[PDB]
Structures are given as C-alpha cells and as structure tokens.
C-alpha cells in the first residue's frame, strides 16, 4: 500500500506511509513536505526506502528541488529514507543526539546535524525544537510559522488513542514536562500533526499531557 501525499495548507503537504503487520494489520506514519517556491523540505522520511523514492518522484515530477530532510527521532519510521537521500546528495539533518543514536545502532547517519536545542531550515521556513524526552529520549518538534502548523511527531498522540502506546524508549516521568516546554514557546498553533494518525488542533497537546500524567502513576 503506497505513499499518500495530500495538501493540508498552502505549500504544506502531509505524507503518509503504511506497514502491513501480519496478524495485526495496517499502521501508518506521517511526515510533511514544505514548499518555498520550487524548493522542497521533507520533515520525516517515509517508513521505507521504496516510499521515500516515491516521495522524491512526487516532488521532482512537480518541478521541486528537494533541499533537505530532517528526521525528528532516530527510529526507522522517520529515518528509513536517510540512506537513499544521502545516495542522491540531498542534505539530511537530525539533532546531534539523534545522529549519535543512529551511529550507535549501526544505522546510516545524516550528513548534517545541529547542536543546540533550536535550529532553523529554509531561512525561517522550519523552526526545530528539542523540548525534552517523551516518546523517545531524542524527539524534536518542528514549528512552521507561515502555516502555523506544529509537527509534533511521535511526541504527541492523536485523539484516536486513549493511550500513549509504546513506551519502551519513553521517559514517562518527563514526557509531560517536555510538552509543557512546547506550550511555553507560546506558538500560535492552528494545527498539530502527529507522527501517527489524524491531524488535530492545539488540543492534541493537552490530550497528550493527560495520557502522560495519567501513566505517571
């Protein structure tokens, strides 16, 4: 079941890839493509090399030049495409921590990484922030100031979920404070895109804090 790419605001597309788990069924994973004229930036690669190449043809068939990708945590749902993008001399970015985790697990690493808790791509198009551990030790978020989209990735949970889900790599203790760190940025959020499931509003944030503060005890 192939990549889907759908418009969700001007110059912002939601890309969704799928995995068929034999005995369970189909799960999905979300990234974004962000356009600035004919320059494209990918937030999270698709979940396979094959879906990443489709995403690459989606962009190049439209006359876009993919300038970069940024992966929001070290796991394969967000990094499967890094080797392929590296093979094509499109710059790949992660936090320094995400880069070091990939290296430790023997995985291809990005060609670029940022050291602070804050980083920007596309001359202000994408603002990246490390709010603290949550779903994973290294999860970051992306704020899109024009469209007022917050890409929360796996650090936020859609309303389809009455539970935080997998927590093996989680800091359950710290996951609520990391969200409150995002709230303190005081972003004018109109939409929140989760790593899995449906797009919602800023409400997705309080909703995740609750699944979190709940699980704390």
Is 57 a known ligand-binding residue? Answer: no
Resolution reached, in Å?
2.1
Helix, strand, coil percent values for the chain (each to nearest 5) = 25, 30, 40
Distance CA 187, CA 182 (A): 8
Q: What is the CATH number of domain 1-217?
A: 3.60.15.10
| Contact predicate 20/26, CB 8 Å | yes
Is 77 a known ligand-binding residue? Answer: yes
Is 73 a known ligand-binding residue? Answer: yes
Number of Cβ within a 10 Å radius of residue 1? 10
DSSP string, 78-141: HHTTHHHHHTTT--EEEEHHHHHHHHHTT----SEEE-SSEEEETTTTEEEE----SSSSS--E
Is 116 a known ligand-binding residue? Answer: no
Question: Parallel, antiparallel, or unpaired for β 92-95 and 65-70?
Answer: parallel
Is 112 a known ligand-binding residue? Answer: no
Q: Which helix (H) or strand (E) holds 176?
A: helix 172-184
Place of tokens 């418009």: 7
Is 154 a known ligand-binding residue? Answer: yes
Place of tokens 């704390």: 216
Is 69 a known ligand-binding residue? Answer: yes
Is 95 a known ligand-binding residue? Answer: yes
Method: X-ray
| Contact predicate 48/80, CB 8 Å | yes
Is 196 a known ligand-binding residue? Answer: yes
| Contact predicate 114/86, CB 8 Å | no
């Amino acid at each position: 079941k192939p990549l889907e790419v759908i418009k969700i605001e001007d110059g912002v597309y939601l890309h969704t890839s799928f995995k068929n788990i034999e005995g369970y069924g189909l799960v999905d994973s979300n990234g974004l493509v962000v356009l600035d004229n004919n320059q494209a930036y990918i937030i999270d690669t698709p979940w396979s090399e094959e879906d990443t190449k489709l995403l690459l043809s989606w962009a190049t068939d439209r006359g876009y030049q993919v300038m970069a990708s940024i992966s929001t945590h070290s796991h394969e749902d967000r990094t499967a495409g890094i080797k392929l993008l590296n093979s094509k001399s499109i710059p790949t970015y992660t936090s320094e921590l995400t880069k070091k985790l990939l290296a430790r697990e023997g995985k291809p690493v990005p060609t670029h990484y940022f050291k602070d808790d804050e980083f920007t791509l596309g001359n202000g198009l994408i603002e990246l922030y490390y709010p603290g551990a949550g779903h994973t030790e290294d999860n970051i978020v992306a704020w899109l100031p024009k469209s007022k989209i917050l890409f929360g990735g796996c650090l936020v949970r859609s309303h389809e979920w009455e539970g935080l889900g997998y927590v093996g790599d989680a800091s359950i203790s710290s996951w609520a404070d990391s969200i409150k760190n995002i709230v303190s940025k005081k972003y004018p959020i109109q939409m929140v895109v989760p790593g899995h499931g449906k797009v919602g509003s800023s409400d997705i944030l309080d909703h995740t804090i609750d699944l979190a503060e709940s699980a704390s005890n």
